[PDB]
């Protein structure tokens, strides 16, 4: 696209100093050519130009006291990127590496991923260069309060709803929430997501990701006049996602037959489908042993040190662990086995080489982690609904909506790809669907933002 | 607990002029040692010391004119005790006896009770020393208006939601509400509970306490590997609570065999199980005669002047009228008949002594009124949810919710006591459960409040 | 007045547990019959009955951490007594003795006093049971921050403006202010008085009380067809008040002949009239020794251990130190020397008895401390005006204003007593004047408050 | 200073990407060692670390429509650097080069500058990358409206008061104001300075800078036991600043003998001391000829094409035009002429090399532009005052105040430098006095900001 290309160039020049942000913009816009080309009206209202500039950026000073009475100062950021479709929403990262470029790129991606969920959620990102590593509980507490003392005025249940991320967990969330409540003098607990159950957190949080991934695979199966029952799945990891996935597959008639730790991997032909087997997974995460072999020990199964489960012949490939777990050569094995379903779960588990690769393959079904792992985001939106309704949903109610929306996600992606004649391209469809809802709202909304 | 003991000590010293508040604290905390004993972290952050002091207290002047044009002045209160788990919530009492001691004592309890419902509700209590008895409708209107003219600024749907109590009913709630919406200039109907259906009240209000009590019982049966079928019950009172209780027991297959009034008790061995019988209760209440004898003269049954039915032989005891209805005397009568189910419904229908006594009773199942009569409170939370959703639920939906919650309440109480190594002690269970949630919440929220 | 008597009665009954408040009411109202007797309209609208009840009272929890990381909890108060003539105004006291009784009693007086200044200022009083003695600077900072985190919402430049008092000085005011501006996110520096000059404090703060007292006196002279020239004065204390008083008397041509300390008194017949003499007072105060004797050892003058100077012969008596400094004993000494000018400066430097006694004294002119020491208060009002104007006045401008106002105060007091047919009674004058303005205001404002 | 050194280095590593800001910090901080050295407590509270991070930064998207209906997008900024001593205050710049670094460096300087005026004003800077070059009035109007649509929420009379700067004059100010007043629904005209008189602008705006500089010189004179009577002054430029300086100089008995333009200079040994000559300047400014020669032509005085007036023998040198007017070469000319008074008027009219140098001359008086040219800032502060007072000051009143404050700026500057043993160093004195008021306020305010 001419417009696309032009916009990218401008950004390249204007934000040469925010490299992360720059890369992200390129990558994103690069792949909307068609959609844009199909929409000349966008250009007349400088839609893309508006899109690449956050609606509002907030930076602020954060002075805080350590345990020895020593004074420190950090910087706080809150980037409210896009709010056309819902309140701003997005995590807070506390890490020494935090800067505007990082916040911008993260916040830009955020709007897209949130759009995709089908829920009314805008996109934002925030954080601080504060380094939680090595700090006492009390110190984290003090920092969190100082942080919120300024932050509070820029957010709210109908404005901006933050959540955790690198460095920000349930504990920080609780600390920020206490400070918020005190300042504002009311409850307004939906101002934050990722809360403990005692003050409004949601049921099904842990399982959310693994479960959601399975429900997505199901919609794929359905699309293809196929089914989950009887399917074999190759997983990576033994962590939370892998666990949720394993449990939900079993429950649906399918079965996971591999897992992988740093040590290599296990192969369970009977499937990781028993109560014991599935919880034992909880066991190991806990232990700390980073040893995928504990399973092989416990259960009497094949352990494959310095190995990756990608050589195994299964029906479904589902990497739930590390980044770049599937490389060019790993993918080759997968294709040699003629596997038809490649479902990304973890973030960026596939190399680009790999990705372009499997991507050529005419027989295969490739699904992007951003649509596939959206369960986590969904449950945070549910938390919001529950807080607004002033009641808690049962775990069955939560699971239900999760199933339902994940289905909408798969389907919406596919229809979009089809609309722009790409066929059944799930990777592209995800990109397109998030973008389009945003574009449509902005168009209907006129030139204000 | 030394901690507990000590904290208790301090309160006695510091609030010597607040006799009521002092007792309550005493009574409630003394009962928590084991929880406290296992939660060493609580102390480090002065948990109990903070809990005993209300977050915020408000008192204000209330001048008002009478039908003669004469001016009067009263004082209004609002104690916002704890809002860690929800917005402040608690009724308003208009009685000449009203003072801060009383407000504080009710507010303190209100929070534990509110916590136990499983809904996101805080604790508060307010009212005035105004005396509505003898006042014309218009004077009552004038008073409510003046009262709200100041109060409005301290409350709100997401802050503090009051309700009625001694002296405060629907009429008053209506007047207060009319003034609030006029001042604020919006709807915000969830600012108060106990409203008429025309401007947001819930269905099932009247049946509420009565029904939840039974649902509570039902959960007891189940625990006990038992059933409601063919059981007999001894009820005290003939009011709205007794009436709802009777209705439902009957639908459940059990039967109420006693009623009670200020003039003695009645005996009806066939059981108060017919429409006609049941509806008679409402005529009785409506007449305002306060004579339980009219049932007896109507239906031709046994009538025992000057006596409490605490001597009849039944499976289940349910005091639904007054305070310290049951005494050691009447306690003995009961045990003597070896009855195993003692279910307080009314507020404190038993003397602390009768209470111990009953508890010692190795065969008996004793249930606390604060857990048991929680249906009136649940219904007010549902009223809030419906106002938030901008729609009305059906009586069937209310009822079903009521039903699931009551069960959870019983169930939660049981595992709490269960966790403390106290067994099936529903009395301590109710305490421990309410406290624990507040503690968890305050703990996660840090030192802000 | 029967009205008065009756109202007094009710207060005693109703607030029996508020001994301090009860006295004050008693004392203040008993003194107003004639005003009340001539204002029949007051009764019809229940004027006194409303006045005795604060418009609004606030109490709140204040948790704070110490240098060790140990948590403490205190209670904060803010009584907003009367705002009919200006925003609420009154200091904050941090003392272990703090309770509602005390807050109420100070708040009640604060309003009369504030009314008498002729400036548009209401009455209020607040504080905490926190005890600053023994606390590190940082702990004090932490406490102030916590205290303001809640208070902020109840105060403001046009609502309620607090100041310092026992336990609350510049340091504290600074900490409170830093927290306030951070929370509110604006300047609004007129929210508090007694601020350092760097962020809005006034010039002439220290001299204030001392100077106004003299200006007050000057107005007495004038009334009396007299002069300050060549008069001698007996001062008590050597602090900031005594110092300002001495300075100015001296500029006015009169002379201070006594000083007093906890260790006795001094006699300096030449008069404390030189720069060196006068500045010595500041070194003395600064040393923190609390020995009036150092003046004597320095300047070589008379020194009377264990004695009050109330026995020296002078034209004018000005107690500037403590409470119930003057007694019947010392009263006699004075009268005996036939001294005609008794000017309270310090707060209640006299026993009610010594007080009557003096008043009976047909030749004497007795002046009340609340009228006389009003300069400290005037200066805080000027601080407010300067903050509102966004500029600083010169010491000359402050001083001149101070000067005109003090005169009006004396003059207004005189015509008030004058109007009641009590003659040159400046003690009743001060009462009547303060009350009258409040009454007129509340009368014009209707029954709202 | 080791602390200072340490701070400067961190900013350098940290903000490498904002060279202009990095550069200003080093320059300002490096000139403060002695105050710092004298104040070890600053370092304990991380004072300098805090000062270098603005309190709050806001960036926002600005979409706007041109006359042809084409849509444009720009970025809006507002850096609220420091508000310890007053509401944030600082101008807005509309230029294509605007970016954060730029905004930060200017807002940082602004704090020190505002501090130094003695008025209660914080420091801030804002603007947009919008290019007013070539925009119709209507487009400018539209941009201003869009800009203020988001900005309004972050400013206000007691919060942040912007003003003009490069690209923002009375036209823009008026457009922004109309939009503000419309959104907020009230007057609040003190939200912006530089307003037209019709809606709250102040008299004496144009003369302010010129007049104020003369008032400052008058203070130097008096400190040096000299007078302005009889002095000849060499001015640079013929604009507004030069014009006001000349007029005030004449009034006070001195005389300007030179004016300069890009064309060379004129010498009027008789003095530009007549209404005709003075007003002529005005006509020269308007003409658009941009030629100093016009004056020579008009009044028959000497014109020296291609030259600067720095070789003329005069008593006082006052550069009122370009930055870097005076270089090492020109400075030697002055030194060589044995001139004692060198008064910078325009911003940075002296090169660093030249400044240093002049600074080494012992017989000289060197005054920084930052203090001398403050008359402009002062009258904006006076605008705020009149707006709060709801009235307009007469030109005399304004002039009178300007006069008084200017003297205070000089004297305060002198006092500071000397308090640090620098003698009569007006250059460092300005630095120290600005910084000092801020440091003091921040220390008193605690660890909030």
Curated annotation (Swiss-Prot), chains A, B, C, D:
It catalyses: L-glutamate + NAD(+) + H2O = 2-oxoglutarate + NH4(+) + NADH + H(+). One of its GO terms (biological process) is glutamate catabolic process via 2-hydroxyglutarate. GO terms for cellular component: cytosol. This is NAD-specific glutamate dehydrogenase. The record marks 165 as: Important for catalysis. CDD domains: NAD_bind_2_Glu_DH (cd05313). The active site is at residue 125. Pathway: Amino-acid degradation; L-glutamate degradation via hydroxyglutarate pathway; crotonoyl-CoA from L-glutamate: step 1/5. The keyword Lipid biosynthesis does not apply. Belongs to the Glu/Leu/Phe/Val dehydrogenases family. NAD(+) binds at residues 209, 240. SUPFAM superfamilies: Aminoacid dehydrogenase-like, N-terminal domain, NAD(P)-binding Rossmann-fold domains. It comes from Clostridium symbiosum. The keyword NAD applies. Homohexamer. Keywords: NAD, Oxidoreductase. Substrate binds at residues 89, 110, 113, 164, 380. Its EC number is 1.4.1.2. One of its GO terms (molecular function) is glutamate dehydrogenase (NAD+) activity. Transmembrane segments: none annotated.
């Amino acid at each position: 696209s001419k417009y696309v290309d032009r916009v990218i160039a401008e950004v390249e020049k204007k934000y040469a100093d925010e490299p992360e942000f720059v890369q992200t913009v390129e990558e994103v816009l690069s792949s909307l050519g068609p959609v844009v080309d199909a929409h000349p009206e966008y250009e007349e209202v400088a839609l893309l130009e508006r899109m690449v500039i956050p609606e509002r950026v907030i930076e602020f000073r954060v002075p805080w006291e350590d345990d020895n009475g020593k004074v420190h100062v950090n910087t706080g950021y809150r980037v409210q990127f896009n709010g056309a479709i819902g309140p701003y929403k997005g995590g807070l990262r506390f890490a020494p590496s935090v800067n505007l470029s990082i916040m911008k790129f993260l916040g830009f991606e955020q709007a897209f991923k949130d759009s995709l969920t089908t829920l009314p959620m805008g996109g934002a990102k925030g954080g601080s260069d504060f380094d939680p590593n090595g700090k006492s509980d009390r110190e984290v507490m003090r920092f969190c309060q100082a942080f919120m003392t300024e932050l509070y005025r820029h957010i709210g249940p109908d404005i901006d709803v933050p959540a955790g991320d690198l460095g920000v967990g349930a504990r920080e969330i609780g600390y920020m929430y206490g400070q918020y409540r005190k300042i504002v003098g009311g409850f307004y607990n939906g101002v934050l997501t990722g809360k403990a159950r005692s003050f409004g957190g949601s049921l099904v949080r842990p399982e959310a990701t693994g479960y959601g991934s399975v429900y997505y695979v199901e919609a794929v199966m359905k699309h293809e006049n196929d089914t989950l029952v009887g399917k074999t799945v190759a997983l990576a990891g033994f962590g939370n996602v892998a666990w949720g996935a394993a449990k939900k597959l079993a429950e649906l008639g399918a079965k996971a037959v591999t897992l992988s730790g740093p040590d290599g991997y296990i192969y369970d032909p009977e499937g990781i489908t028993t109560e014991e087997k599935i919880n034992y997974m909880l066991e190991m995460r806990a232990s700390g042993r980073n040893k995928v072999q504990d399973y092989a020990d416990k259960f009497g199964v094949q352990f494959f040190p310095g190995e990756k489960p990608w050589g195994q012949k299964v029906d479904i490939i589902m990497p739930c662990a590390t980044q770049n777990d599937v490389d060019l050569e790993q993918a080759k094995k997968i294709v040699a086995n003629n596997v038809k379903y490649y479902i990304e779960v973890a973030n960026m588990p596939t190399t680009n080489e790999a990705l372009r690769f499997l991507m050529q393959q005419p027989n295969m079904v490739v699904a992007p982690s951003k649509a596939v792992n959206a369960g986590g985001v969904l449950v945070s939106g549910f938390e919001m609904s529950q807080n607004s309704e002033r009641l808690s949903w049962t775990a069955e109610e939560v699971d239900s909506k999760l199933h339902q929306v994940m289905t909408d996600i798969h389907d919406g992606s596919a229809a979009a790809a089809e609309r722009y004649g790409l066929g059944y391209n799930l990777v592209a469809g995800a990109n397109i669907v998030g973008f389009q809802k945003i574009a449509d709202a902005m168009m209907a909304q006129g030139i204000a933002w």
